[PDB]
């Protein structure tokens, strides 16, 4: 029950502005992730922010193109992606987990107990 959005296909090069929002989540500090899955891969972890600290960390992949801003309301995050390339074709998850430390932002699937559907992303060229 994640709202995602802002997928869809682009030319590569172009960029995207995925979104997350977590309704109950102006409470609490939380960490919110994206992870991606291509058609026969893993799910790897793309880049996550700690609200507890103000964090944001990011693979090594997607460093300097992908960037995650805060909204004004607090349980709302984007990911801005530019400069696309074919391989960050894929479906793009957003995860979400309540945060009682605030202390890491967790980089694997199980450590996050929201999800949503995804939201597909095609780069062509």
């Known amino acids: 029950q994640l709202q995602e959005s802002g997928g869809g296909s682009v030319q590569a090069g172009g960029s995207l502005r995925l979104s997350c929002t977590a309704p109950?989540?102006?409470?609490?500090?939380?960490?919110m992730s994206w992870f991606r899955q291509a058609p026969g891969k893993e799910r790897e972890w793309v880049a996550g922010?700690?609200?507890?600290?103000?964090?944001?960390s990011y693979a090594d992949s997607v460093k300097g193109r992908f960037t995650i801003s805060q909204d004004n309301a607090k349980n709302t995050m984007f990911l801005q992606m530019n400069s696309l390339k074919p391989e960050d074709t894929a479906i793009y998850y957003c995860?979400?987990?309540?945060?009682?430390?605030?202390?890491?932002?967790?980089?694997?699937?199980?450590?996050?107990?929201?999800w949503g559907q995804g939201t597909q992303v095609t780069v062509s060229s």
């Open positions: 922010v700690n609200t507890g600290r103000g964090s944001t």
């Open positions: 109950g989540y102006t409470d609490s500090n939380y960490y």
């Open positions: 995860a979400v987990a309540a945060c009682h430390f605030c202390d890491s932002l967790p980089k694997t699937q199980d450590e996050y107990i929201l």
